[PDB]
């Protein structure tokens, strides 16, 4: 049950003046797409305040990426879900290298060790698995919504309630220009994230998404079935956990999609015209060399 | 649970390309304002007969309307959510008049004898109580969405499952090129459906509204109950249940909201370039003469 909001002054919506001239706001199965510009981030927030939502972040960091998370975890206590309760998931082999980032009221966090896999692939891989683990140890009990990132990153601007749905995936920002066929899913029919060349809403970035602990264990559970499979089967996919999720999000269309304003590598890609804010962010990094002993 | 969608061939979304430059497809709490062109009903249509979605149309048909019903029905029966399951709700105080009319398969209709009132305003009011009772009778156990409109109205192109939502209104077509000033409120503060002159966002029209049978029910108790307060404090809203549906939808914001192509009159406002369909119209009428005995 939803009281009812307060009195609240601000702007009337505009009917006939679109919100976006140069995007598509709108999915064709009626999923928001989140940009600048198509929220009043005061309506939103108080209709998830009058819930008391929770937000939960998992964050993976094994072996080297441990390095990663001060400043990652900083700048999630500035731009993150300020306001609302949040519990962060930091899992990792190594809990005594967790900095101690200091938290706003109602935020937690919680370090959750698990194995480290050799290499990067499957580290990447197995967070399907440990987050799908981790539904039924903490996440339905504790959180409302689970988003689940990329440690490599830090947050520049507002990250809110505006991205909160039973299901989301991110564009990502290598591709969101781009025509299908330049979309590098799967494309080995042996595999089961492989999608055909005529097939493809968007290009999503495993790096980003999240939704209600229901539907984050659903996607997680499949994706990791399937990763389970193709192992069987003798086939890792091209791009890993993120070319399962492109299979999964397919088949079961996110409610809202985030713009690559909520993905973003500006060393790669500078500051298009077409990105009015930056929110979060790679970090500089060796890929190699972080990724390997 | 949601099993996967079938592989499905049709146009990739344009990320780059606005789906429509000359109207807001979007409010700014992120819900869907439905116009042609913002949804591919063919995955529409899979989602939701992957559900064996069934949707409940109520109209009331009482005194002289009875005669709107059989236009109301055919014309429902080419254009309204044809290949899902639809369980009509007929409300009157004549059930002998109601016409026989040839329904597809899967499609069913309930006659439910009702009262009449003396006034219009007390038969366009008393709905809200009327819906509301039949929540429990019978809606909750039979269909999964609600669809509540005017009889006096007919069907001339596709109403489908891109309606269907938690929590939605429709634009109303006197208004929705309006400034909130203008819309038509109630402007007394001594009516609980008091709207001030700053606050609004969209004018809805009384005659279209519909969402989860849950939702529903929340929303006609609400306007029920408002309209009760009202009475005994000797005051009757300027535009009866319209105006208290207005107050609920502005304190509880709809999941979408129908564009004008769903609720029109041609005879009044002709066919602008903004609407590419005309979906669900007025027939010509005489208010006074068919308002009275
Ligand atoms: O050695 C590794 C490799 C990957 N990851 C986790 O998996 C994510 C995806 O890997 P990458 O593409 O960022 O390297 C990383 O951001 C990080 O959260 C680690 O923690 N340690
Ligand atoms: O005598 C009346 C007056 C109103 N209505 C119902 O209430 C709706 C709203 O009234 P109106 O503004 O269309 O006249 C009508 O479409 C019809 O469904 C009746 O059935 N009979
Ligand atoms: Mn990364
Ligand atoms: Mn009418």
């Known amino acids: 049950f939803m009281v009812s909001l307060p009195r609240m002054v601000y702007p009337q919506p505009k009917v006939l003046t679109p919100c976006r001239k140069d995007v598509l706001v709108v ?4 999923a928001p797409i989140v940009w600048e510009g198509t929220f009043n981030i005061d309506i939103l927030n108080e209709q998830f305040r009058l819930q008391n939502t929770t937000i939960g972040l998992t964050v993976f960091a094994i072996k080297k990426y441990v390095a990663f998370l001060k400043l990652f975890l900083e700048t999630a206590e500035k731009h993150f879900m300020v306001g609302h309760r949040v519990h962060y998931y930091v899992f990792t082999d190594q809990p005594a ?11 937690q966090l919680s370090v959750l060790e698990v194995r480290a ?6 580290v990447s891989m197995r967070r399907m698995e440990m987050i799908s683990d ?6 339905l009990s504790e959180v409302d919504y689970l988003v689940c990132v990329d ?4 947050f520049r601007d507002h990250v809110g309630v505006e991205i909160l749905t039973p299901l989301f995936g991110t564009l990502h920002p290598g591709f969101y220009g781009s025509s299908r066929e330049a979309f ?3 494309r080995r029919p042996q595999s089961q994230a492989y999608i055909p060349k005529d097939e493809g809403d968007f290009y999503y970035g495993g790096a980003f998404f999240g939704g209600s602990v229901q539907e984050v264990q659903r996607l997680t559970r499949a994706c990791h079935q399937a990763m389970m499979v193709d192992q069987a089967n003798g086939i890792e996919a091209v791009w890993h956990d993120e070319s399962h999720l492109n299979k999964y999000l397919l088949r079961h269309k996110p409610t809202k ?3 690559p304003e909520y993905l973003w590598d500006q060393q790669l890609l500078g500051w298009p015209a077409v990105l009015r804010k930056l929110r979060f962010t ?10 390997n002993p």
């Open 97 to 107: 290298a967790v900095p101690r980032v200091t938290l706003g009221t109602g935020r």
């Open 257 to 259: 999609v985030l713009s």
């Open 134 to 139: 981790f539904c039924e140890r903490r996440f």
């Open 117 to 122: 896999y050799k290499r990067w692939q499957d």
């Open 151 to 154: 440690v490599d990153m830090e």
């Open 184 to 186: 590098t899913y799967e």
């Open 282 to 291: 790679a970090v500089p990094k060796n890929h190699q060399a972080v990724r």
């Open 27 to 30: 999915t064709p199965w009626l």
